[PDB]
């Protein structure tokens, strides 16, 4: 306590309850994080879908 009159004392305490985040906030932020940090997975899934729909068009208009 020899420096409390120079740099401040220990009377003011931290205002935080150390509690977990709310469930909806955690879910929404995790879904945004999955979308941002795993964007090659969505890009490649979209590539597979766009490729298979073209083969569907070919197989549809070919056998007619």
């Amino acid at each position: 306590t020899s420096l409390d009159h120079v740099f401040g004392d220990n009377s003011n305490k931290l205002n935080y309850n150390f509690e977990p985040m709310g469930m909806g906030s955690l879910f929404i932020r995790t879904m945004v994080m999955v979308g941002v940090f795993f964007f090659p997975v969505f890009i490649m899934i979209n590539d597979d879908y766009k490729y298979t729909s073209f083969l569907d068009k070919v197989a549809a208009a070919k056998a007619a």
């Binding site: 977990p20 985040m21 955690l26 932020r29 995790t30 945004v32 994080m33 940090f37």
Partner: protein, 546 residues
């Protein structure tokens, strides 16, 4: 002479950190560090004249093979070509003056030889990075400068904010390092080799350029990765000069210029957004080192756009890198001298007059500031005007918006650099400590970088200097008018009453605060879930009481 540019700063670091330094002390270690940088600079000068001017590249098999399993073959091999010679000349020349400065700036530090050894290791890993001929020895250099940046940013380890700044630099760069590693996997898989001369790509699979761009955006501190760069001011002033001039931030731009496998839309958009963002960020700061840090981020944005423009744009990007290193290191060294003359204060509201600094420090700040703002027929004028004129004739419609962003950024840069000079010297005194530094070593350190600024005007970086891209006088001389507008506004010292815009920009758009809870707190909470609910909960098997 060729291997002396790479090995020998690493040797200086090894000497000054080992128990050999217990016999030399501070006094002997300063001599060892300065000599070990002078030799490497002389070697790099010889390499520069041989390779750039006489066009004779040299390839050295140094330590045999590193590892070779299947068709994945990594060798301990260097290659010294035009880009490598450019980078080696720049890195060793800047690091020599920074060592000469640091031997006097950190004189009163208790562990001076440890600091000098860390600086030498950082320089040597940068030399290893640019001298490598394949991707894996490049990754040695990449992670080596990352580790040495961690050691040097958090040098004053008893201060918690410095420790957290070093950890932040490591983590932000670790994200981009992961993406760069995945890109190296793509490149090797679809081309069959790791050496640069066998990596000629016309049309690749998109993930290659994107992931290598993300890995470069980490080190060059572009948008959504710039957050570590401002906090890296916790380290001492020589660390900041070497981070912002020659090492670390120029590595991603070097990698993109070397590979040339990007897709230009992402590169142009990222670079121009970064330039405008860092321009408005540096206009609203009062910490003397943070303004210079944001100007570094802005110029890296300029170089990013230029390498987006094309092969000529890639050459202009390397040219602006080379000329930027000299005046940026000079700016940081002059700012360190001004800080030491004012009792350690870094706020520009507590400066003024011409008593707290030497005449040479004020001259250094003035000349490097004039080169940065593109004053005509100085060093930065040639490279910055080349990039601006190349952006004014690109046939991509995206480059139309990028050019406008660059012109606005140029006006902002001439505003806040003139503000940095005005607050430091022109206004009345508002500090209380006048201890001006006039030692020989930091003055000679500044004089060397000013000589390099003159050298870039006298001898160009490449053949683009003097080539005329044919533009009307209105398009050509507009950046001069934007420089004058910034100077007049900053000397008038005018301000606006829109305080909510002022506090949105001065708080740097809240990127750190939004990152404190969009990935970070969720990572902590998901760890709580995986431990408490999973390991202790759902998967836990209890005992059978009897």
């Amino acid at each position: 002479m060729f291997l002396l540019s790479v090995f020998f700063p690493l040797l200086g670091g090894l000497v000054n950190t080992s128990p050999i330094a217990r016999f030399l002390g501070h006094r002997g270690s300063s001599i060892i560090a300065i000599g070990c940088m002078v030799v490497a600079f002389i070697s790099s000068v010889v390499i520069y004249y041989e390779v750039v001017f006489m066009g004779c590249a040299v390839s050295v098999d140094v330590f045999g093979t590193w590892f070779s399993v299947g068709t994945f073959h990594a060798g301990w091999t260097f290659n010294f070509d035009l880009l490598t010679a450019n980078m080696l000349f720049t890195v060793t020349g800047v690091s020599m003056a920074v060592h000469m400065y640091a031997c006097d700036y950190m004189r009163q530090d208790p562990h001076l030889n440890l600091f000098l050894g860390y600086l030498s290791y950082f320089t040597g890993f940068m030399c290893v990075l640019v001298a490598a001929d394949n991707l894996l020895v490049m990754l040695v250099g990449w992670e080596g400068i990352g580790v040495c940046s961690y050691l040097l940013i958090g040098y004053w380890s008893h201060r918690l904010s410095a420790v957290k700044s070093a950890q932040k630099a490591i983590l932000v760069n670790r994200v981009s390092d992961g993406l760069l590693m995945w890109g190296v996997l793509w490149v090797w898989y679809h081309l069959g080799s790791l050496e640069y001369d066998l990596l000629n790509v016309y049309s690749a699979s998109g993930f290659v350029g994107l992931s290598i761009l993300i890995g470069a955006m980490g080190k060059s501190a572009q948008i959504l990765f710039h957050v570590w760069l401002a906090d890296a001011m916790e380290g001492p002033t020589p660390v900041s000069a070497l981070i912002h001039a020659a090492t670390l931030v120029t590595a991603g731009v070097y990698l993109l210029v070397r590979l040339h496998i990007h897709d230009e839309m992402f590169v142009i958009i990222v670079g121009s957004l970064t330039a405008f963002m860092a321009g408005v960020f540096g206009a609203t700061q009062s910490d003397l080192k943070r303004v210079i840090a944001y100007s570094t981020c802005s110029q890296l944005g300029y170089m990013m756009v230029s390498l987006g423009l094309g092969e000529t744009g890639g050459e202009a990007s390397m040219g602006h890198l080379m000329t930027h290193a000299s005046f940026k290191a000079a700016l940081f060294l002059a700012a360190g001298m001004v800080i030491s003359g004012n009792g350690g204060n870094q706020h520009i509201a507590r400066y003024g007059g011409s008593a707290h600094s030497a005449m040479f420090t004020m001259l250094t700040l003035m000349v490097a500031s004039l080169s940065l703002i593109g004053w005509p027929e100085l060093s930065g004028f040639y490279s910055k005007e080349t990039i601006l004129n190349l952006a004014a004739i690109c046939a991509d419609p995206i480059a139309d918006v990028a050019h406008t962003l660059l012109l606005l950024t140029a006006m902002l840069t001439s505003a806040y650099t003139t503000k940095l000079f005005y607050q430091c010297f022109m206004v009345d005194f508002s500090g209380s400590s006048v201890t001006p530094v006039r030692n020989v070593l930091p003055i000679l350190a500044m004089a060397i970088l000013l000589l390099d600024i003159m050298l870039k005007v006298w001898v160009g970086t490449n053949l683009l200097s003097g080539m005329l891209f044919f533009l009307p006088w209105g398009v050509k001389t507009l950046p001069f008018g934007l420089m004058v507008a910034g100077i007049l506004t900053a000397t008038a010292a005018v301000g606006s009453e829109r305080f909510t815009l002022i506090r949105f920009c001065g708080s740097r758009w809240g990127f750190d605060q939004l990152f404190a809870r969009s990935p970070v707190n969720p990572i902590f909470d998901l760890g709580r879930i995986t431990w408490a609910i999973g390991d202790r909960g759902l998967l836990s098997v209890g005992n059978l009481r009897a």
